[PDB]
Amino acid sequence: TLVHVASVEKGRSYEDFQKVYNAIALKLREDDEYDNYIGYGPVLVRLAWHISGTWDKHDNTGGSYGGTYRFKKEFNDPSNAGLQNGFKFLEPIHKEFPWISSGDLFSLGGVTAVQEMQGPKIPWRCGRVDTPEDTTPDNGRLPDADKDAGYVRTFFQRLNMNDREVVALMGAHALGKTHLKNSGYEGPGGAANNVFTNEFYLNLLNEDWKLEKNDANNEQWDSKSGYMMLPTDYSLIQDPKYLSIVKEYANDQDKFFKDFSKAFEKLLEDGITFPKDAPSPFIFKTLEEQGL
């Protein structure tokens, strides 16, 4: 098992990272047209998850630490199709703040997006260090969407996530949309959202879902309201243990926010050893809280 020790960017502190947060947040506000006015929030959340979701608890390969998404093998992963948009968004931020590591930037992009979209505060720790090209994990570590609850449960054990953590994390599927050219799934169109809420769970429970084939000849669940769910999303109401948790989050916005915050921080920190004298996690103020 590889050890990756968090190492604070030299001389940097909370205020430095709040500046980076602010630059990302201001650009999120500025570049509002992206993806039919969804904006870049959802894709940045997905990017933070995909750079983290390569982790394997068994040998500490993959994970957010090394910033390896910057290397061609990983950015060309078919599982990552469309994330180049998030990377391009972050390029000018990195140019302005060249001192931040790639892993810190990609993960901070996700935290910033969640908070700016009115989601929970996500505490965030610095200190990821760029590692060489040969540390890039092979393609195929990110999950398939065409599978069932048993697949989801087993998949997430590799990331050390339990049922509650899985169901909480999946609530991010309130955000943005599927794009046929990226993943072979499509929708929503007009029903897409860039505000972080517990809508995913409400939709699972309340919509009249029909199993249909999309234009890529893949099955997905669609509703008359114009919403969609992936087979893996729908599996959360097919499995009785997942279903109980779906009901809980559908009925308690605050609980969902608290549990998502913990699971998302954990996801972004998997694989990293924080020295006992490392700084405490940072909680960034939103632009709104700063009057900016």
Ligand X SMILES: C=Cc1cccc[n+]1C
Q: Interface with ligand X by CB under 6 A: which residues?
A: 173, 176-178, 188, 228-230, 233
Binding test (CB under 6 A) with ligand HEM, winner from 17, 28, 39, 49: 49
Shortest separation between residue 264's beta carbon and ligand HEM, angstroms: 6
Please, what is the minimum distance in Å from the beta carbon of residue 198 to ligand X? 13
Range in contact with ligand HEM (rule: CB under 6 A) among 38-46, 56-64, 90-98, 214-222 = 38-46
Structure tokens belonging to residue 217: 């000849």
Residue 166: phi and psi, rounded to 5, are: -60, -50
**At its nearest, how many Å lie between ligand X and the CB of residue 200?**
7
β-partners of residue 219 are: 213
Nearer to ligand HEM, 43 or 272 (CB): 43
Binding flag, residue 46, ligand HEM (CB under 6 A):
yes
Asked if 62 interacts with ligand HEM (CB under 6 A), we say: no
Q: Which residue has the tokens 């065409």?
A: 146
User: For residue 184, is it left (φ>0), alpha (ψ between -120 and 50) or beta?
Assistant: left
Residue 129 or 237: the one with the smaller Cβ distance to ligand HEM is 237
Residue closer to ligand X, measured from CB, 93 or 236: 236
Residue 228 contact, options ligand HEM, ligand X, none, Cβ 5-8 Å cut-off depending on partner type: ligand X
In contact, 186 and 178? CB cutoff 8 Å: yes
Question: Beta partners for 178?
Answer: 187
Nearest CA to 114 out of 189, 40, 19 is that of: 40
The answer to whether residue 115 forms part of the interface with ligand HEM (CB under 6 A) is no
- Pick what 79 binds: ligand X, ligand HEM, none; C-beta below 5 to 8 Å, kind-dependent: none
**Residue 40 touching ligand HEM (CB under 6 A):** no
Residue 46's binding partner among ligand X, ligand HEM, none (Cβ under 5 to 8 angstroms by kind) is ligand HEM
179 binds, among ligand X, ligand HEM, none (CB under 5 to 8 A by kind): ligand HEM
- To ligand X, the closest distance from the beta carbon of 162 in angstroms equals 21
Alpha-carbon distances, residue 268 vs 48, 152, 241 (angstroms):
7, 19, 25
Q: Residue 287 has which token pair?
A: 């632009």
Name the residue nearer to ligand HEM (CB basis): 64 or 131. Answer: 64
Selected from 20, 149, 175, 246, the binder of ligand HEM by CB under 6 A is 175
Measured from the CB atom, is 90 or 172 closer to ligand HEM? Answer: 172
Query: From the list ligand X, ligand HEM, none, which binds 182 (C-beta under 5 to 8 Å, kind-based)?
Result: ligand HEM
**Which chain residues interact with ligand HEM by CB under 6 A?**
42-43, 45-46, 49, 82, 143, 145, 152, 169-170, 172-173, 175-179, 182-183, 185, 230, 232, 264
